[PDB]
Amino acid sequence: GSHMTPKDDEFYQQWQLKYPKLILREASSVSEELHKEVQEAFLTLHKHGCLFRDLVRIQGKDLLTPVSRILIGNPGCTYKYLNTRLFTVPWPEAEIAAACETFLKLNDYLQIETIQALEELAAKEKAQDEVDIKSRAAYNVTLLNFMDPQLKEEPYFGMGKMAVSWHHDENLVDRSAVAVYSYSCLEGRDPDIWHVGFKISWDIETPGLAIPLHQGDCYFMLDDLNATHQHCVLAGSQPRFSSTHRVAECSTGTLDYILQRCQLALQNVCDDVDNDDVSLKSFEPAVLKQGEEIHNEVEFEWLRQFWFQGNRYRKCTDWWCQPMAQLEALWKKMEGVTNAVLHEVKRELPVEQRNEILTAILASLTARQNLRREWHARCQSRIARTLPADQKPECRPYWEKDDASMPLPFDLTDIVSELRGQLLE
Ligand SMILES: COc1ccc(Nc2c(F)cc(-c3c(C)noc3C)cc2Cl)c(C(=O)O)c1
Ligand SMILES: O=C(O)CNC(=O)C(=O)O
Ligand SMILES: [Fe+3]
Numbered sequence: 538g539s540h541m542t543p544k545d546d547e548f549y550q551q552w553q554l555k556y557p558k559l560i561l562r563e564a565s566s567v568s569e570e571l572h573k574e575v576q577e578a579f580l581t582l583h584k585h586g587c588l589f590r591d592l593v594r595i596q597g598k599d600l601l602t603p604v605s606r607i608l609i610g611n612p613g614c615t616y617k618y619l620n621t622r623l624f625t626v627p628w629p630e631a632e633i634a635a636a637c638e639t640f641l642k643l644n645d646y647l648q649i650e651t652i653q654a655l656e657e658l659a660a661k662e663k664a665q666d667e668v669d670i671k672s673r674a675a676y677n678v679t680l681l682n683f684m685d686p687q688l689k690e691e692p693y694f695g696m697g698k699m700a701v702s703w704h705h706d707e708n709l710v711d712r713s714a715v716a717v718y719s720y721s722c723l724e725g726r727d728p729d730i731w732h733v734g735f736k737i738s739w740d741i742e743t744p745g746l747a748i749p750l751h752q753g754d755c756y757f758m759l760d761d762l763n764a765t766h767q768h769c770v771l772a773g774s775q776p777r778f779s780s781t782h783r784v785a786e787c788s789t790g791t792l793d794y795i796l797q798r799c800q801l802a803l804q805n806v807c808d809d810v811d812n813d814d815v816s817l818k819s820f821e822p823a824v825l826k827q828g829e830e831i832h833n834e835v836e837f838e839w840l841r842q843f844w845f846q847g848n849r850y851r852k853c854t855d856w857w858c859q860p861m862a863q864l865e866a867l868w869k870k871m872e873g874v875t876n877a878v879l880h881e882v883k884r885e886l887p888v889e890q891r892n893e894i895l896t897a898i899l900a901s902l903t904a905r906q907n908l909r910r911e912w913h914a915r916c917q918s919r920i921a922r923t924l925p926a927d928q929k930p931e932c933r934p935y936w937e938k939d940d941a942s943m944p945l946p947f948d949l950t951d952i953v954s955e956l957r958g959q960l961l962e
Contacts, residue, residue: 564753578636593619610678613792713784722775815873822897
């Protein structure tokens with residue numbers, strides 16, 4: 538089993554004993570001006586329609602998340618959850634930018650409140666590391682969420698209606714904290730009030746917690762609580778917003794990173810003039826393995842990921858329009874690089890040099906064929922035909938065999954099997 542609410546007498550003591558790194562700051566800790574500006578910036582994004590239900594993937598199935606979301610954060614940053622990489626609507630129409638400036642200000646307070654609470658947790662634990670404390674609270678993005686109840690029951694502690702089921706927040710730096718601003722309009726828990734559920738991983742015997750959330754309430758998952766504990770969102774009655782500020786692990790998920798990866802792969806190309814005549818400087822297996830691995834990374838983790846969302850964020854900002862075309866152009870050159878590798882393996886080389894190249898690009902080429910088949914189906918599913926027109930997925934970049942603009946075709950089975958047969962015969 539069962540759950541425990543502030544009604545139960547064991548509540549406060551079970552909190553400090555099994556969920557101690559959970560910190561709740563009631564609305565009394567927010568300025569009424571701050572709460573009004575955030576709720577207005579909140580309500581502004583609902584009128585403009587900047588909150589979208591992402592088309593995620595779970596256990597091979599394509600799912601529509603019942604919660605409408607938007608990723609706001611540092612420019613050129615990303616946050617990948619459930620095989621769907623969200624791109625940041627950056628912070629410092631005019632009402633859209635004012636809201637991002639608002640949530641940037643909300644990010645500053647929560648970062649200051651997290652550092653204070655994290656320093657308090659060090660004193661209670663003690664009875665250098667200050668670089669990790671400031672780093673674990675340096676929130677780079679925030680994920681806004683919408684849920685109008687106008688539903689799966691909690692299957693472990695009898696908490697009832699759930700908006701978001703049990704999960705850990707993915708794509709987070711190790712031991713990084715999470716701050717959430719909640720905003721909503723006797724034999725258990727109140728179904729009309731919004732709660733946040735909490736439980737220990739692998740464990741349904743320890744009674745879980747149901748923290749009631751009112752307008753302006755804030756809770757903080759500190760240190761390893763996200764790793765040690767799972768959390769859910771218990772449905773209420775009135776529609777509810779939320780602002781979850783995270784330290785997104787983006788060591789390989791920023792624009793500057795993927796741009797550097799593209800330059801590294803194009804160091805193997807004579808960059809005198811952009812044309813269809815791609816001449817590779819080297820044919821060593823390592824640099825050819827690297828060039829085609831970055832080929833897959835820039836296409837599937839960025840290109841196919843961005844256009845699968847159909848540029849919903851274009852309804853908010855045009856920040857990614859130029860970089861995505863730049864990545865599209867850099868990826869087009871890599872397709873000419875792949876052809877340059879293919880045009881060389883079929884040259885009168887030796888066989889010992891030909892075999893050393895096949896083993897380098899074999900796995901990288903098949904993955905490009907398998908992932909292109911997944912993305913072709915992800916953009917064309919019975920659920921993927923029901924979104925609004927301005928949000929439907931686009932299978933970009935796509936081209937037919939008649940398309941003479943591309944040096945290589947889409948379907949690679951007539952090329953990977955010809956390459957697979959060469960490694961044998
Ligand atoms: C019917 O299709 C769906 C799709 C998503 C669902 N919830 C859900 C989610 F949207 C996001 C996360 C999540 C992760 C991982 N990391 O950060 C975040 C944020 C985790 C979950 Cl669990 C649900 C559902 O809860 O029932 C259903
Ligand atoms: O809003 C909350 O309390 C947290 N729930 C989430 O779905 C999330 O963080 O994305
Ligand atoms: Fe969450």
